Amino acid sequence: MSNFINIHVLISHSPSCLNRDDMNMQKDAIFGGKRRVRISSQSLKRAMRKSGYYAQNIGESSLRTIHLAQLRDVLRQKLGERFDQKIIDKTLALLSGKSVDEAEKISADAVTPWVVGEIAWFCEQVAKAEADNLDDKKLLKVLKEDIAAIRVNLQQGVDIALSGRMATSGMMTELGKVDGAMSIAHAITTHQVDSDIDWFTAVDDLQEGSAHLGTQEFSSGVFYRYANINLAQLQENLGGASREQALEIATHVVHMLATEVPGAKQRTYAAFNPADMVMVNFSDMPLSMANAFEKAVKAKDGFLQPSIQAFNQYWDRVANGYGLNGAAAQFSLSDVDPITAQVKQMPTLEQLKSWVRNNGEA
Amino acid sequence: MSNFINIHVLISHSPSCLNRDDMNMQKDAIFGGKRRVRISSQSLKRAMRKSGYYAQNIGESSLRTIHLAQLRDVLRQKLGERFDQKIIDKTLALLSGKSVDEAEKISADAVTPWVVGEIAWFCEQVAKAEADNLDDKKLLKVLKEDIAAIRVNLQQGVDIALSGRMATSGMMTELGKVDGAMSIAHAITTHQVDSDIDWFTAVDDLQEQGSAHLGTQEFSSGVFYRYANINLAQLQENLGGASREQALEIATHVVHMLATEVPGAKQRTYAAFNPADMVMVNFSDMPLSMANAFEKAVKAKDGFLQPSIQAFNQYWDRVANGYGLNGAAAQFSLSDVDPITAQVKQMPTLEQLKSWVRNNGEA
Amino acid sequence: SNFINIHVLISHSPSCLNRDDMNMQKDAIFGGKRRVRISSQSLKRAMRKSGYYAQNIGESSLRTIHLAQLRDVLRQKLGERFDQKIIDKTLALLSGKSVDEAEKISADAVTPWVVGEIAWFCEQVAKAEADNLDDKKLLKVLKEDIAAIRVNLQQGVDIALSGRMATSGMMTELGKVDGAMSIAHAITTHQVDSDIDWFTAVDDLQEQGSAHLGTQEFSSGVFYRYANINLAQLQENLGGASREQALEIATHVVHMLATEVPGAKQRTYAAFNPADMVMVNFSDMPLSMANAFEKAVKAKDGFLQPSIQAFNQYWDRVANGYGLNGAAAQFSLSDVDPITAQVKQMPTLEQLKSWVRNNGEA
Amino acid sequence: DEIDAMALYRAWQQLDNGSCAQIRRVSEPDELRDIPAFYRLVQPFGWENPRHQQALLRMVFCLSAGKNVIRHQDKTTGISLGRALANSGRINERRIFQLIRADRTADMVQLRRLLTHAEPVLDWPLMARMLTWWGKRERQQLLEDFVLTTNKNA
Amino acid sequence: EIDAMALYRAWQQLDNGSCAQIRRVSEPDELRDIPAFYRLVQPFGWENPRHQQALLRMVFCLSAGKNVIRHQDKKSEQTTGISLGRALANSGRINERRIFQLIRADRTADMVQLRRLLTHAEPVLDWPLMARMLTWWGKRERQQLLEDFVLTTNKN
RNA sequence: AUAAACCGACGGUAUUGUUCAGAUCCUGGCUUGCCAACAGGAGUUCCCCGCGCCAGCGGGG
Structure with a gap:
């Protein structure tokens, strides 16, 4: 009852537009026959990667790109003093195929997350390959033996270990395929939303008479974010890392999911709101509490309170009907008395995080 | 009424893409003149076979493949300490119909489910060729007599005993034909669905923020209705004359999986890990699907879930009274409802329902 | 009246209950519109091979024809063609008990195919007494035939209701047993939008991976099954035979039509649906109500309700115009009802079968 | 008539x-x-005859995109909505899959949002007739026209 | 009924x-x-609840006054009687924006506004029409009211 | 009792893995809802109980 760690977050946002269409439309989704404002999971994940908190507590994020011409120069810059450029070019060419050099624009198949640690390690290997004249096929055969040693490098690129990586060309198709370890859902509102429309203008300071016109869709909303971390898979993706090491990353994910908000239209719609509820529970089976809002919550005193209430009630029903999955802990800023008793109430967030660090104990 | 066990499941899913087309579109199907989102029965089956619950409670799933060149290596690894490589090669060669060359790649006719247990058994039986030499056709004729002895080894399969298999080549075409024993339907939504589209981008860290053409991913939420049916006698036969109680235990495992397991498609990015909101099980002399309860696409009052439960119960009452069926019928629901009528016993928890099944509907 | 008419409206979930030689759903153009079809042979096999059939017809009390009972009659119906000694010889070879030994239960009428076959046997033993091959010598060459008729003399109701078994040891023209129930092709009441399932086959040893592709046509729809029963023919082929017994069989036919479904792809699509409507009516002439759906039914709230409505509305204006007379009863799962009475409304199927069993009297 | x-x-x-x-x-x-x-x-066209009301609602709703969103161009037969949206080059065919799969009010909404984004040139009476009926064949024909034109201009 | x-x-x-x-x-x-x-x-609809709401509306409108709503039978040439919209338009005392607000009102509020209009209008109309529209009082009836008013003013 | 009769096209199958829609923008300027007006005629106020009765007085609901 402790492989999966489930993260449920209820967070309310003031009038804003945190996720947009290709036509300046608010991202939405139909649930329970009602329209909900949606925030795509990609937006949340990238919002986490490029956050300062991630930079402070987890490390450097990966470099996702197709431009191998730029990446060539970057790798030549950061690995210039440790390796020969002849080796770097060959390495990058082996992982994707086939850069060589001097080309103004080299593009891979799709946007790939590259970490400099893996590339440096591969340089260390292909150096030996050049030393003992190992054929590239033989080198592949050797490297495929111990994939864990490759996965150890993902400690300097945890976002890949969490979000996964897909490879089509190069040797990365045999060595760089990463599964898991974090499953994150698209954030949807717990209630129905009819999106408001802002009618703005642009004043020409050199004319007092006729009107300009502009439309920007926006809305406030109580979003439910769900996340899930497969600890075993996370340890595997980090090269057999300890569980204690994975749980810390998990806590950081809880914090970011509880605090981080996408920066879309935040200069004009400053919707910098913290989460009003964060519940974390350990289970061996992934469970999402989205069906707590299938019957779209109706505002009594706002949407937040009945959202918390509905959430708690559904968690109680699932807990009773399917049996208690494992340890659970809740942190709220609301005036709502919890109904289920087998969930530890945490006054502050850092206490919840501490509770997670100790594998759901004290 | 006690040969077929019918499993009905109403389960609501948050926005996701649990099963795709060849154009990466959501699988759909037209019911009652209305579009319903569909989940393939093959998808559900494989989702069950490769599930952790299956591994914990039922055992190891079958290995389906055409690559006999890899399969020979696998079988040599797992059976090498028990048999000689030539015997294993002759075994696999007899079963598949192809020849084990020690080559790099030799393929079979089609994807075949192989269970290592029955293969080991066939190694033991073909080790009788090491004795007074019987012709391979002779040995075949000997094995033809007792098929039950072969089906006993299928307790390390079960997914084959449940879903069956078909052979075209080798000796398996005459010894490995399994028919039953579980009939499962394609999961369709109880309501009309207009699928949404996620318009995504991919930020290039060395060029972006810049302009870009966008990508599309069709997704949707929805209340799905899963139906399954188990022929107990056929299961007992498929397991080599196994006891009824055993078949009922396996049946309960099927119930739990059908109630909890969700296909892992697009779950890293959409994560629709939702439990079933209703699970009803009823014993009958004849299989019975309650799909026509949603022939008229349910319309949302307070979501699609509650009117789905309601419609299900109403149609079940109508059919039950109309055709005079007498279960052996039990319903488990998370929601508070007004369901009926006796004796479709209400079970507060899923485990009580499974226990009710294990004791042949009398509990 | 002599004929019994059975009309069934039954809805099927997405499936493929009947394929052609190219793995596509069988169809039929009706009213200029394409309809999905379930061949009559598929339905009739689904019935004849069912367990209910085996219980109520496979093990009926009238399945065994005792030749010793037919001593006198066979002598007077074949006395014009054969001598008495030849007949007695044949019966003695077939039973095989010579003695007469009047059973004190000598029948009044005989089944036609019986006299048809035993006449052939009489011919054979005649030319066998002319050659002449002794009883043993000829019984050796007639082994398969004798066994062949011996198994048929224990399946009276099966042959009487469904016909001979496509491999019965029958030779004479009278041996061609038809009826007594006629099953029509089941067509959809509406124009069908066929779906195409696009499946793959995953290889567990190369999950990278090249996918095994495949397609399969499937469709849901409301089918109209029609069948009729000739009671006189059923009584003649069980001759016998009281009308009440024939009715008792007719009830079984009604039940089988209301319940039984072909097993094509039911392991993967599972269209185990029960009939949503079934009407039975006596008549001097069999009539299908297919022209009720000659104009393709269009979906208002599903296809089922407007199909029921179309059927009833057709029966209202058309019934009296044609030679339908009486009596009629209908068992359905949803209103409305036909405005015309003289069509008793039955709450359950068992009440309907009981209604049929009492010759349609209330 | x-x-x-x-x-x-x-x-x-x-x-x-x-x-x-x-x-x-x-x-x-x-x-x-x-x-x-x-x-x-x-009123003149007019609204007081219920046979015309739906059609008028659709037409006016589409025109409501803007005063110069729908650009009328005289013609053998004039440019159709599919051909127009295809010629614009700004529209992605998936959104038209959406348009053909949409139901009631929704489709019109989706249609309007397209027009504003497309600034199409077309023969207005054609679009008027198609909006007058807007059956399954109008949808299908729309998608056909779009796909065929886009395929023919790539 | x-x-x-x-x-x-x-x-x-x-x-x-x-x-x-x-x-x-x-x-x-x-x-x-x-x-x-x-x-x-009492004579008309109690206790059959189907009419109750409607009755509540009708009487409420009538509660405007004893001779506020003046009833006029439909002329044989008229084919249809003068409608509430046409009445309020013919009165000339009513401004269309309040009927806009009338179409935008919800539940009890609208009735409150409607009565307030009648007293100020002293309209002449065919009472069964108004009764019929009040029985259902759906969105289409509201919009139809506005149709009659605006169209009457623009056409005459 | 019809080129009829008797009469399954059947079994086996994840469509999978990667992805911010982003950045810029006052709906601004001008408007009485004013003119006329007793709420006064009227003791009905629906059901019991006690005591009166050219009258009426009380007690309960």
Whole structure:
């Protein structure tokens, strides 16, 4: 009852537009026959990667790109003093195929997350390959033996270990395929939303008479974010890392999911709101509490309170009907008395995080 | 009424893409003149076979493949300490119909489910060729007599005993034909669905923020209705004359999986890990699907879930009274409802329902 | 009246209950519109091979024809063609008990195919007494035939209701047993939008991976099954035979039509649906109500309700115009009802079968 | 036999900024029923005959995209909506898959959002007739035209 | 199963006391509190709830005054009677923006506004039409009201 | 009792893995809702009980 760690977050946002269409439309989704404002999971994940908190507590994020011409120069810059450029070019060419050099624009198949640690390690290997004249096929055969040693490098690129990586060309198709370890859902509102429309203008300071016109869709909303971390898979993706090491990353994910908000239209719609509820529970089976809002919550005193209430009630029903999955802990800023008793109430967030660090104990 | 066990499941899913087309579109199907989102029965089956619950409670799933060149290596690894490589090669060669060359790649006719247990058994039986030499056709004729002895080894399969298999080549075409024993339907939504589209981008860290053409991913939420049916006698036969109680235990495992397991498609990015909101099980002399309860696409009052439960119960009452069926019928629901009528016993928890099944509907 | 008419409206979930030689759903153009079809042979096999059939017809009390009972009659119906000694010889070879030994239960009428076959046997033993091959010598060459008729003399109701078994040891023209129930092709009441399932086959040893592709046509729809029963023919082929017994069989036919479904792809699509409507009516002439759906039914709230409505509305204006007379009863799962009475409304199927069993009297 | 003239379009062109502003500010055609300037606009054609009402709601709703969103171009036969949206080059075919799969009010909404984004040139009476019926064959034909033109201009 | 015009007639013939009790009411729900209402509306629809809401509306409108709503039968040439919209338009005292606000109102509020309009309009109309529209009072009926008013003013 | 009769096209199958829609923008300026007006005629106020009765007085609901 402790492989999966489930993260449920209820967070309310003031009038804003945190996720947009290709036509300046608010991202939405139909649930329970009602329209909900949606925030795509990609937006949340990238919002986490490029956050300062991630930079402070987890490390450097990966470099996702197709431009191998730029990446060539970057790798030549950061690995210039440790390796020969002849080796770097060959390495990058082996992982994707086939850069060589001097080309103004080299593009891979799709946007790939590259970490400099893996590339440096591969340089260390292909150096030996050049030393003992190992054929590239033989080198592949050797490297495929111990994939864990490759996965150890993902400690300097945890976002890949969490979000996964897909490879089509190069040797990365045999060595760089990463599964898991974090499953994150698209954030949807717990209630129905009819999106408001802002009618703005642009004043020409050199004319007092006729009107300009502009439309920007926006809305406030109580979003439910769900996340899930497969600890075993996370340890595997980090090269057999300890569980204690994975749980810390998990806590950081809880914090970011509880605090981080996408920066879309935040200069004009400053919707910098913290989460009003964060519940974390350990289970061996992934469970999402989205069906707590299938019957779209109706505002009594706002949407937040009945959202918390509905959430708690559904968690109680699932807990009773399917049996208690494992340890659970809740942190709220609301005036709502919890109904289920087998969930530890945490006054502050850092206490919840501490509770997670100790594998759901004290 | 006690040969077929019918499993009905109403389960609501948050926005996701649990099963795709060849154009990466959501699988759909037209019911009652209305579009319903569909989940393939093959998808559900494989989702069950490769599930952790299956591994914990039922055992190891079958290995389906055409690559006999890899399969020979696998079988040599797992059976090498028990048999000689030539015997294993002759075994696999007899079963598949192809020849084990020690080559790099030799393929079979089609994807075949192989269970290592029955293969080991066939190694033991073909080790009788090491004795007074019987012709391979002779040995075949000997094995033809007792098929039950072969089906006993299928307790390390079960997914084959449940879903069956078909052979075209080798000796398996005459010894490995399994028919039953579980009939499962394609999961369709109880309501009309207009699928949404996620318009995504991919930020290039060395060029972006810049302009870009966008990508599309069709997704949707929805209340799905899963139906399954188990022929107990056929299961007992498929397991080599196994006891009824055993078949009922396996049946309960099927119930739990059908109630909890969700296909892992697009779950890293959409994560629709939702439990079933209703699970009803009823014993009958004849299989019975309650799909026509949603022939008229349910319309949302307070979501699609509650009117789905309601419609299900109403149609079940109508059919039950109309055709005079007498279960052996039990319903488990998370929601508070007004369901009926006796004796479709209400079970507060899923485990009580499974226990009710294990004791042949009398509990 | 002599004929019994059975009309069934039954809805099927997405499936493929009947394929052609190219793995596509069988169809039929009706009213200029394409309809999905379930061949009559598929339905009739689904019935004849069912367990209910085996219980109520496979093990009926009238399945065994005792030749010793037919001593006198066979002598007077074949006395014009054969001598008495030849007949007695044949019966003695077939039973095989010579003695007469009047059973004190000598029948009044005989089944036609019986006299048809035993006449052939009489011919054979005649030319066998002319050659002449002794009883043993000829019984050796007639082994398969004798066994062949011996198994048929224990399946009276099966042959009487469904016909001979496509491999019965029958030779004479009278041996061609038809009826007594006629099953029509089941067509959809509406124009069908066929779906195409696009499946793959995953290889567990190369999950990278090249996918095994495949397609399969499937469709849901409301089918109209029609069948009729000739009671006189059923009584003649069980001759016998009281009308009440024939009715008792007719009830079984009604039940089988209301319940039984072909097993094509039911392991993967599972269209185990029960009939949503079934009407039975006596008549001097069999009539299908297919022209009720000659104009393709269009979906208002599903296809089922407007199909029921179309059927009833057709029966209202058309019934009296044609030679339908009486009596009629209908068992359905949803209103409305036909405005015309003289069509008793039955709450359950068992009440309907009981209604049929009492010759349609209330 | 009663047809809605092209005059409507002209009227829409000539209508004042106020009423047009009242009309453009609308989410659904029923809300178009809600506003009076609409009734004043659509009376001659006209609104008082229920056979025409739905068609008028659709047409006016589409025109409500803007005064110069739908650009009329005379023709053998004029450019169709599919051909127009395809020629614009700004529209992705998936959104038209959406358009063909949409139901009732939703589709019209989706349609309007497209027009504003497309700035298409087309023969207005064709679009008028297609909006008059808007059956399954109109949808299908729309998608056909779009796909074929895009395939023919790639 | 339909409410007759007799109600109107009854309202005409009822004494000043009960009319005073009914007239001074703010909301249709508050109309339930007084007995004279029950005595008036007893023959037509109680206790069959299907009419109750409608009755609440109808009487409420009638509660505007004894001779506020002037009834005029449909002319043989008219084919259809003068409608509430056409009436309010012909009165000339009503501004269209308040009918806009009338179409935008919800539940009790709209009735509150409607009564307030009638008193200011003194309209002439075919009472069964208004009764029929009040029985359902759906969105289409509202929009139709606005149609009649705006169209009447623009056409005449 | 019809080129009829008797009469399954059957079994086996994840469509999978990667992805911010982003950045810029006052709806501004001008408007009385004014003119006329007793709420007064009236003791009805629906059901019991006690005592009166050219009258009426009380007690309960």
